[PDB]
Subunit: 296 residues, 4 copies
C-alpha cells in the first residue's frame, strides 16, 4: 500500500413507543426542532467537525424516510450512506453495522437526538478530530447525570472511571453523545458482551480506551448548550431555545447548506440552486442572503 | 345525520425543511399529531363519519396512520386535493361523500379549547338548516375571513383577508352546513387569487339570511398551528394544561370512550401497545378513574 | 352583600433572590403584577369591597400601588399577617372587616381563566348560606387540599396535602363563605405543622352538610404562580392568549368598566398616563370597540 | 504622584411607562429574569470582567430599592456606590453623573437590561478590559439592527461607520450595551451636544474614538447569546432561556456569589455565611454545593 480520513456515523434508531403517538406518524429524528428535522442538528455537528462521509443507521422502515429527506448528500458536498438496524441492541452495535463503512479509517459517532450550541464549537470539535490515535469524548455538567454515561475525575482533573447510567453518580459530568474513535474501535466493539439490560454499551467501548490510557475526556463548558430532545417536554424546550436564538440573530443554528458553504464543500452557484425551490419561505430567503452578506 | 370533513391542505414549502421529513398535519403539537385536534373537535360534535382531504403525497400517510377509524368507533374515508386551489374545493372533492346529508368542515391546523366546547358544537350541529360559523376576537383580523356586525350584533358583511378589516372578529376554521353547500360550491367562480373561497360559500348563506354567526368567547382558546412559531406556541399551551391537570386535550381514544363509541374492553386493547409510555398509562387510568 | 379578601401571604425565601427586590405578588405574570389576577377574579364575582392581607413588609407596597381603589370603583382596605401561620388566619385578621357579611377569599398567587367564569363565580356567590369551593383535576393532588367523592359525586372527605391522596381533585384557592366562618376560624386549633388550616375551615362546613363542592371543569385553566417555573409557565400561557386575541386577561380597569363601576370618562382618565404603551392604548380602544 | 484600575458603571435607569403596569410595582431592572433580579446579569458581567468597584445609576426612587437588594457589595467582595439620575437624558450622561466616581481611571459601562451568555465570555471580556488605551465595543449579528447602534465594516473587517438606530442599517451588526473606555471618555462626554431626540448618545462617544483611530470593535460571535429584556415578550423569552440552561446543567447563569467565589474575592467561609439565610430554597442549596463540588 502507498500513501498520498475520519468518517461519521449518525445513530438515528427506533425510539420505541416512548414518544407515541407523536412518533406513530414519523420516527423521532424526523420530528422537527423548531423549523428543521432533528437529524439536521447532529448532521450539522459532524459537518462542523469537517466530516463529509457519513453513515446514517436507522430502522428498515425509517431508512427510506431519511433517504427521501437527505438523499446521498451530494447537493451539500457530502457522501451519505445508509445502513439498516433491525433491532435496538445498543449504541455500540453501530460499529458492527458500520464495520465495512469505517474500513481502516478514523471515525466519529453521534446520537441523532443530541443538539449542541456555542462559541468555538468548531474548535472544540477540531481538537477532538485532530487526535489521530485513541478516543475523545466530551464531559458536560448536568442536573441528572444518572440518565447518562458518567465520568469521574481525580483531584488533578484526570478521568479515573466511567459508569453507564449509575443510580449513584460519582459526579455531575455526563458523557455527551458525540464520540471520536481511532482504528481500534471496531475490534474493541467485536469483543463486547451485551450488558445486564441486553445492549452493546458505548460506555464499555470508552472504558476499554480509558484502561489503555487512550481516552481523552475534554470538558464541554457550561457556556455551551447541550440539550436532549427525547421527551415531549425537552423537544419543546429545545425548539423554544433555537427559536429564541434564531429570531434574535437572524442567523440559523445547524443549517446544513450554510455549513457546507462555509466549509467550501459547495460554492456560491450551488448554494443559489439550493435556494431556488425554497425561495417563497424564510429558509430559502436566508440561503439567498448568505450569498451577499458577510457573517463573522 | 351530519358528516365531517377535515381539510388537511398542502402548506407548499412554507414549513420546509420540517415538512420535507413529515406531513404538516402529522407534525406533533406537544405530544400528539396535529390532526388529532381537529379530529377530536369533530368527534366532540358527535361526528363519526369523517372524510380526510389532503395532498396526493400526504393522504396515504394519514390513511397509513389512522386506517378506517374502526378502532376508535369511527368511519374514516380519504380523498385527495390535487392542488391547493381554495378551501371551498373540499365540497366538490367531497360531494359524493356528503351525499344528501348535513356536513361540518374543520381545518387541519386549527386547535380549540375551553369550557362547554361540547355544548357550543352541539348547538351549531343541531341547526339542520342554513350554516353556522363562529367569530373570535383576534389581534390580526386581516389574516382571516372577517365578519362585520351592526349595532344590534347582526352579521352584515364577510371579507376574506381585507387590507382594511371592518372588525377584529375572525371566522374560525370550523363550519357547519346544510344540504345546500355542494350546489353553492359548484356555482362559485375563482377569486382574484385563483381560489374557491370558503368566505364566498359563507357569504352566499349570509345573502340568503341563513348564516348563523355565533361568538366564540374570549374564554375559549382558538389557536393556529400554520407557522413554526404558532406550532411551538400551541405545543407550550397544551403542555401547560396537560401537565397541570394530568388530563389530555384532544385524545381521540378518550373522546370515543366518553361518547360510548368504544367500550372499556376496546379502550383496554388500545392502551396495550402504548402501555410502556404515559399515553397508554393514561388510557388505562381512564378505565378506573371518574373524571367530571 | 359579599366582601372579598386577597391573601397575599409571605413566601419566606422560596423565591429569593427574585423576592429580595420585589414583593412576590407584585412580580409580573407576563405584562401585569400577579395581584391583578386574583383582584380581577373577585371583581368578576361582583365584589367591590376587598381586604388585601400581606406581610408587614409587603402590605405597604400594595397600598402604595393600589391606594383605596377608588380609581377602579373599588373599596380597598389593608391588613397585616405578622407570620405565615395558616391561610385560615385570614378570617381572624379580617374579622372586623368581614363584620356580619358574607365573604370570599382568594389566594394571591392563583390564576384562573375560561368561558363563563363569570357565571361559575356568580352561582357560588348567590348561595347565601354555607360554603362553596371548587374542585379541579390535577396531576399532583398531594400539594393541595384533596376532596374525595363517593359514587354519586357527593364530597365525603377533605385532606390537606395527603401522602396518599384519595383522588386527583384539588380544592382551588377560591372560597365562598357565609356568616359562620369567623366563629369556625376562632375555634380552630393549629395543625401538626403549626398552621390554622383553610382545609379545617372547609371540613367544618362539610361536617355540617353545608359545603358545596362544584367541579371546575377541565376547560378552565387554574394555574399556580408560586414557583419560578410555574410563574414562567403562567406568563407564557397569558402571553399566548393575549397576543392571539388582542384582548387582556385580568385587566382590572376593563372588568370595572364592564361591571359599570367606572364610566367611559373615568376609563379615559385612567388610559391617559399609560397612553404611550400598549396597555393605555388597550384602555383607549375599550371605549370605542364592541367586544362580546 | 507615585505608582505602586478599571471601574464599572451600571445604568439602571427609568424605563418610562413602556412596561406598565408591571413596572408600576417596581423598576425594570428589579424585575426577575427567571429566578434572579435583572440587575444580577449585568452585575455578574462586570464581575466576570474582573471589575469590583461599580457605580449603579438609577432614579431617585429606585436608588434605595437597588441599595436594599445589593448593599455596598462588601458581602460579595465588591465596592458598590450609587448615584441618582433625575432625568432620562441619554446613556452618555452616565459619564457626567459618574465623573467623580471614575476619576482618573479606566471604565466600563453596561446596560442594566442586557443579558449575555456563552463559552469563554470571561476571555472575550478580558481582552477588552486588557486594552489600557482607547475604547472597546462588541458587535453582534441581529435580526433588527435598526433598534441599536449599528457598525459598518469594510471588506477587510475594519469598522468604518457607526449610526444610532438607523432606519436603513448599513449592516446587521449591532453594538451591544457593554462598553470599555480609557481616561478620555469623560472629556469626550462633556463636549457632547444632545441629539435630535434630546439625548446624550453613547454612539457619539464611540464615533469620537473611531475618528481618533482608537476604537476596537470585537465580534461577539453567534455562539454567544445576547438577549434583550425590555419588552414583556423578550423578558419572558429571556426567562425561558435561562431556565432551560440552568435546569439542564444544575448550574446557574450570573449567580454573583459564585462569580465572587471563583474570582477569589470571597473565600469558602464567606460563601457559607451567604448560603445560611438562603438554605431552605434551591439558591442557598446551590451555594452550599459549590463549597464541595469541582465545576470546570
Ligand atoms: C463551518 C463553520 C465553521 C465555523 C463557524 C461557522 C459558523 N456557524 C456556526 N458557528 C454555527 N453555530 C451556531 S454552532 O457552532 O454552535 C453549531 C454548528 C453546527 C450544529 C450546531 C451548532 C452554526 O450553526 N452554523 C454556522 O454556520 C461555520
Ligand atoms: C365527549 C365529551 C363530551 C364532553 C366533555 C368531554 C371531556 N373532554 C373535554 N372536555 C376536552 N376538552 C378539554 S375540550 O372540550 O376543550 C376539547 C375537545 C376536543 C378537542 C379539543 C378540545 C377534551 O379534550 N377531551 C375530553 O374528553 C368529552
Ligand atoms: C365583568 C365581566 C363579565 C363577563 C365577561 C367579562 C369579560 N372578561 C372576561 N371574560 C375575562 N376573562 C378572559 S375571564 O373571565 O376568564 C377572567 C376574568 C377575571 C380574571 C381572570 C380571568 C377577562 O379577563 N376580562 C373580561 O373583561 C367581564
Ligand atoms: C470567574 C469566572 C471565570 C470563568 C468562568 C466562571 C464560571 N462561570 C461562567 N462561565 C458563567 N457563565 C455561564 S458566563 O460566562 O456565560 C456569564 C457570566 C456572568 C454573567 C453572565 C454570563 C456564569 O454565569 N458563572 C460562572 O461562575 C467564573
Ligand atoms: Cl464555558
Ligand atoms: Cl368567554
Ligand atoms: Cl369544562
Ligand atoms: Cl461564535
Amino acid at each position: 500500500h502507498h500513501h498520498h480520513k475520519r468518517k461519521g456515523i449518525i445513530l438515528a434508531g427506533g425510539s420505541g413507543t416512548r414518544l407515541h403517538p407523536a412518533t406513530l406518524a414519523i420516527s423521532k429524528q424526523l420530528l422537527p426542532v423548531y423549523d428543521k428535522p432533528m437529524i439536521y442538528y447532529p448532521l450539522s455537528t459532524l459537518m462542523l467537525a469537517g466530516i463529509r462521509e457519513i453513515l446514517i443507521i436507522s430502522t428498515p422502515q425509517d431508512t427510506p424516510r431519511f433517504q427521501q429527506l437527505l438523499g446521498d448528500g451530494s447537493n451539500w458536498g457530502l457522501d451519505l450512506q445508509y445502513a439498516v438496524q433491525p433491532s435496538p441492541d445498543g449504541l455500540a452495535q453501530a460499529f458492527l453495522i458500520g464495520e465495512s463503512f469505517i474500513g481502516n479509517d478514523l471515525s466519529a459517532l453521534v446520537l441523532g437526538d443530541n443538539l449542541y450550541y456555542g462559541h468555538d464549537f468548531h474548535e472544540l470539535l477540531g481538537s477532538a478530530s485532530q487526535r489521530q490515535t485513541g478516543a475523545s469524548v466530551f464531559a458536560y455538567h448536568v442536573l441528572d447525570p444518572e440518565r447518562y454515561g458518567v465520568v469521574e475525575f481525580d483531584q488533578g482533573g484526570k478521568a479515573i472511571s466511567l459508569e453507564e447510567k449509575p443510580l449513584e453518580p460519582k459526579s455531575n459530568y455526563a458523557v455527551t453523545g458525540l464520540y471520536f474513535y481511532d482504528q481500534q474501535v471496531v475490534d474493541i466493539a467485536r469483543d463486547l458482551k451485551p450488558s445486564p439490560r441486553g445492549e452493546l454499551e458505548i460506555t464499555d467501548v470508552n472504558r476499554a480506551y480509558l484502561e489503555r490510557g487512550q481516552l481523552s475526556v475534554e470538558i464541554m463548558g457550561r457556556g455551551y448548550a447541550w440539550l436532549d430532545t427525547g421527551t415531549h417536554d425537552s423537544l419543546l424546550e429545545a425548539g423554544q431555545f433555537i427559536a429564541t436564538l434564531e429570531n434574535r440573530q437572524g442567523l440559523k443554528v445547524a443549517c446544513p447548506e450554510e455549513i457546507a458553504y462555509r466549509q467550501k464543500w459547495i460554492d456560491a452557484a450551488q448554494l443559489e440552486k439550493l435556494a431556488a425551490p425554497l425561495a417563497k419561505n424564510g429558509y430559502g430567503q436566508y440561503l439567498k442572503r448568505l450569498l451577499t452578506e458577510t457573517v463573522y
